[PDB]
Write a protein that binds this DNA or RNA. Structure first.
Ligand SMILES: [Mg+2]
Ligand SMILES: [Mg+2]
Ligand SMILES: [Mg+2]
Ligand SMILES: [Mg+2]
Ligand SMILES: [Mg+2]
Ligand SMILES: [Mg+2]
Ligand SMILES: [Mg+2]
Ligand SMILES: [Mg+2]
Ligand SMILES: [Mg+2]
Ligand SMILES: [Mg+2]
Ligand SMILES: [Mg+2]
Ligand SMILES: [Mg+2]
Ligand SMILES: [Mg+2]
Ligand SMILES: [Mg+2]
Ligand SMILES: [Mg+2]
Ligand SMILES: [Mg+2]
Ligand SMILES: [Mg+2]
Ligand SMILES: [Mg+2]
Ligand SMILES: [Mg+2]
Ligand SMILES: [Mg+2]
Ligand SMILES: [Mg+2]
Ligand SMILES: [Mg+2]
Ligand SMILES: [Mg+2]
Ligand SMILES: [Mg+2]
Ligand SMILES: [Mg+2]
Ligand SMILES: [Mg+2]
Ligand SMILES: [Mg+2]
Ligand SMILES: [Mg+2]
Ligand SMILES: [Mg+2]
Ligand SMILES: [Mg+2]
Ligand SMILES: [Mg+2]
Ligand SMILES: [Mg+2]
Ligand SMILES: [Mg+2]
Ligand SMILES: [Mg+2]
Ligand SMILES: [Mg+2]
Ligand SMILES: [Mg+2]
Ligand SMILES: [Mg+2]
Ligand SMILES: [Zn+2]
Lengths: 43, 119, 101, 89
RNA sequence: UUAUCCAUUUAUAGGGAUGAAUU
RNA sequence: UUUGUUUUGUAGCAAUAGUAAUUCGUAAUUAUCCGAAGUGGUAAGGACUAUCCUUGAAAAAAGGAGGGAACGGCUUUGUGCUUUGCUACUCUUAAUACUUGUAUG
RNA sequence: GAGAACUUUGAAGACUGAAGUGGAGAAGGGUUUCUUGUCAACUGUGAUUGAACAAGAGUUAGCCGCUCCUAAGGGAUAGCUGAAAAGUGUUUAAAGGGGUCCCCGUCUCAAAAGGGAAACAGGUUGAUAUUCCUGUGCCAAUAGUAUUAUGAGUUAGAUGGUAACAUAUAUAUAAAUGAACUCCUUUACAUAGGCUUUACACUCGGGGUGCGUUUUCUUUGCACUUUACCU
RNA sequence: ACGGACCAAGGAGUCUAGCAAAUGUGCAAGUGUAUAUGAUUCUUUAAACAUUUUACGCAUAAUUAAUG
RNA sequence: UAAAGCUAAAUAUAUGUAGGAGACCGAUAGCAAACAAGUACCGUGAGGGAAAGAUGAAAUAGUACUCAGGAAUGAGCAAU
RNA sequence: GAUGUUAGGAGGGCAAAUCCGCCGAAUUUAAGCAUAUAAUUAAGCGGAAGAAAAGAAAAUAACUAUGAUUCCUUUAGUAACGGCGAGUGAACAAGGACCAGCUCAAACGGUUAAUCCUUCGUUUGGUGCAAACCUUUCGACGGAAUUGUCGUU
């Protein structure tokens, strides 16, 4: 809820970071995307 | 863009001073990056590398001095001790392994495994 | 009382524990932060997740001619800390902002 | 009864029985029991079973960078004495 | 009775003739 | 020190804040903010009364009491203790200055 | 806007009807929040919308909680069991604290609804507010030595009051000797019934402001008239 | 009566142990060189070759609970 | 010659790493996994557990330009 | 005997294919099933190593005798066991691979523990650029040891 453990918060942050799409420039030298409503983190 | 061989000669205090300066520079770069800028965003990496090098040099120096301090004297700090696989450490020294009982030694001395060319 | 003939471990290496450089990571811009700087003489800094309020204050003191009245901090969901630093009335955050770059 | 065994009942499903688990990081730390279903956290052991071969394989030594073990590998081959650099120049 | 077993407590004076209570 | 009368104050917070206005300007002024009472819907408290073969947690923490251990300071002499001479002393808040790790969250 | 029944704005007409699709929270969720974009797919019709996609941005506390205490309980210490793994928790223990040697004494976890140091009001953001700002407070700390002031007591420890009991109002009621060792009390408690007191809420009558109705009628209908902790 | 909407790919008497008869082949009162050794054997060589300058199997004899 | 002990060799290895192989398999095969595979995802949990290779010699030839389109796309007398 | 954050040390966990203990089934086969069989197997738990374990005869034989273990070829699908059913099932010899033996206890030595260890050292060497190792003999101050170390077989 609105009162999380610090560790949990960190995990959430990490997940969020993971979520973001490939920086496009790489493509010139993702399958693991997630949606908060369809696949749960099961934390 | 200072390299290792130039830093080995410098006194520790001087090295420290250099390092602090480098750190300061890095901080500035970071600040710039944070602000809407992309001018010196690629310079930072080099600076970081330099800093790392400096740190390494200083660390090595520190280690050397420590080693000098703790020369012989039976026991030594576990870091300065010859770090090797635990099992190996546990294991008896080759000499120890060899060490036979007195009678056995005598026997060995008396009748060694001689070479006896057979024709 | 301990009386060790030789100390177990001697980390002769330069301290790993975060100094001022690394404690305080960078000033934050952002419209919010700019507003803060303008209206309430508060400087916003991204800082190490493991920096304490005292520590941050110390860093601030060291990194700039600034004195801090109060420091509020929060953990961002990017795994960084945001420190809201209110400066004492003697200082003008704007001028100090300018100085910082 | 609206809280029947199917859908009605699934609505009352709130509150973790297992959390993340320090040591394994696998959400199998039974909170109430204070024991990990996968590692047996508090028990000074890893809790692995020869009847769970797949499980064993998914958690063995080779899974996860081997921070130190990897570094050590090849040392034997080298057989370099400990604390020695190569000759300068 | 000493092995053993059970109980009791802070293991607290060897057996008989509707206040306070301590250095 | 007590009695009589008057003027104040939304008891301080408090009007500088709100709200409803009215303007003037490209934010400021002004005027308002208070006299009577009923309903008993909530909530809390109080004193009670009744029910029980049901009598309805514990500790951290705090307070009070009994009890009467110990007993001013300084100077000198002998081996913390004893003897001799002198009178501002024992408290207590707040402030301050100084060392000791940087003595407010 | 290429394109609109389902994007936005106005005007109607309607519903939800304080047991609300309204405010706050908990569990669970985890960036869904917000701004600027924006439409490949998804948004079972469309869609320019979106809880979608993209880029950023956003969560500030001594006082609100957790953090401390114990509860049902749990994990362990000593043992003792058991091949061990585990099962038990004083059953035959040399089991840290308080005072000036004695006197106590399993440890630790377990409540974000039990117990508990202390915070309120206005303002502010695109998104945070008892957390930021302005203002006013409160609580806990605060080493030693030395100065200071503040008042007590003495010339080793006040007084009043018949009594119930009261008294230090110094910026601030700070100060009313007290050790060991005890004894209490607070913490600290069920349910039902009514009765009372306060509070908010609602209402009524009047005055004061603005708005509404006016073919006719109405000294009229509605709105605002506010006041926090703390002392 | 059951199975089959359709199509593409996958999809089922195999492999080893010992025995058997069949037949092929070599040798034949013998046969099989087992392990293992040896080599002027070493990409193939984990095969091929060689068998110490009375091993054992099965067979050559059967029969009996059995000393035999 | 029990009720004390030690001791290399031959021998075993479906684990790990590193080599070398095949009358082996050839992307529904071969490890579950030729690919960001024990990955995504599912399960409270013990666990379960995929799909998914190929342009060309060369993208240092990955579609220029013109026209119609809101745009996608389409078409070209154009183009690799 | 407690006690020590005393000085110096060790154990714990991970990893298992081979390996060594324990502990321990059932499906299954017997055309049922109960002994048997699966199987001294799987799982469980504990422990090692590059191998482990075994090993230097309280061995086999009945010979003209062999001579630690292990492993292979063999004995041998044999002796034997087995509702004598299903099934199970060695060993000696023989041919090899490899071959390695030993020391404690006890006997003896008291004209004397001849032993051992901690700490502090002392000075010749050999390598290496260093880091480090590698050896060499020599005494102190402690202890341990007479409830027995060391030499002798
Ligand atoms: Mg939650
Ligand atoms: Mg859902
Ligand atoms: Mg905070
Ligand atoms: Mg059910
Ligand atoms: Mg539960
Ligand atoms: Mg006003
Ligand atoms: Mg719709
Ligand atoms: Mg209605
Ligand atoms: Mg209705
Ligand atoms: Mg709503
Ligand atoms: Mg939104
Ligand atoms: Mg649609
Ligand atoms: Mg939007
Ligand atoms: Mg998104
Ligand atoms: Mg609180
Ligand atoms: Mg406690
Ligand atoms: Mg309890
Ligand atoms: Mg237990
Ligand atoms: Mg607790
Ligand atoms: Mg509470
Ligand atoms: Mg049929
Ligand atoms: Mg059909
Ligand atoms: Mg079919
Ligand atoms: Mg086919
Ligand atoms: Mg034939
Ligand atoms: Mg042995
Ligand atoms: Mg495949
Ligand atoms: Mg272990
Ligand atoms: Mg058994
Ligand atoms: Mg059967
Ligand atoms: Mg059958
Ligand atoms: Mg097993
Ligand atoms: Mg091992
Ligand atoms: Mg061995
Ligand atoms: Mg054999
Ligand atoms: Mg035979
Ligand atoms: Mg058997
Ligand atoms: Zn775990």
């Amino acid at each position: 809820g609105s009162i999380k453990r610090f560790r949990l918060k960190q995990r959430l942050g990490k997940c969020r970071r993971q979520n973001r799409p490939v920086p496009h420039w790489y493509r010139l030298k993702n399958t693991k995307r997630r949606h908060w409503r369809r696949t749960k983190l099961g934390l | 863009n200072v390299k290792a061989y130039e830093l080995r000669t410098l006194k520790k205090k001087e090295l420290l001073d250099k390092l602090d300066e480098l750190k300061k520079e890095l901080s500035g770069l970071r600040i710039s990056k944070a602000l809407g800028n992309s001018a010196k965003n690629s310079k930072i990496h080099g600076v970081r590398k330099n800093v790392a090098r400096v740190l390494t040099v200083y660390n090595q120096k520190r280690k050397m001095e420590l080693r000098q301090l703790y020369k012989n004297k039976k026991f030594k700090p576990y870091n300065l001790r010859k770090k090797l696989t635990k099992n190996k450490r546990l294991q008896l020294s080759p000499k120890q392994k060899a060490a036979m009982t007195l009678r056995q030694k005598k026997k060995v001395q008396n009748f060694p495994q001689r070479k006896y060319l057979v024709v | 009382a301990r009386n060790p003939k030789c100390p177990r471990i001697v980390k002769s290496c330069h301290s790993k524990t975060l100094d001022k450089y690394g404690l305080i990571k960078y000033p934050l811009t952002s419209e919010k932060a700019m507003k803060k700087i303008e209206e309430i003489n508060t400087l916003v800094f991204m800082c190490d997740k493991r920096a304490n309020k005292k520590n941050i204050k110390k860093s601030v003191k060291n990194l700039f001619g600034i004195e801090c009245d109060k420091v509020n901090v929060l953990n961002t969901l990017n795994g960084d800390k945001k420190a809201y630093v209110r400066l004492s009335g003697e200082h003008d955050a704007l001028e100090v902002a300018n100085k910082i770059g | 009864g609206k809280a029947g065994k199917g859908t009605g009942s699934f609505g009352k499903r709130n509150g973790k029985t297992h959390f993340l688990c320090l040591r394994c990081g696998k959400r199998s730390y039974h909170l109430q029991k204070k024991k990990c279903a996968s590692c047996g956290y508090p028990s000074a052991k890893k809790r692995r079973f020869n009847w769970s071969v797949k499980a064993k394989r998914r958690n063995t030594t080779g899974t996860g960078r081997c921070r130190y073990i990897k570094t050590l590998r090849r040392k034997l081959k080298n057989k370099f004495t400990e604390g020695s650099t190569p000759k300068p120049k």
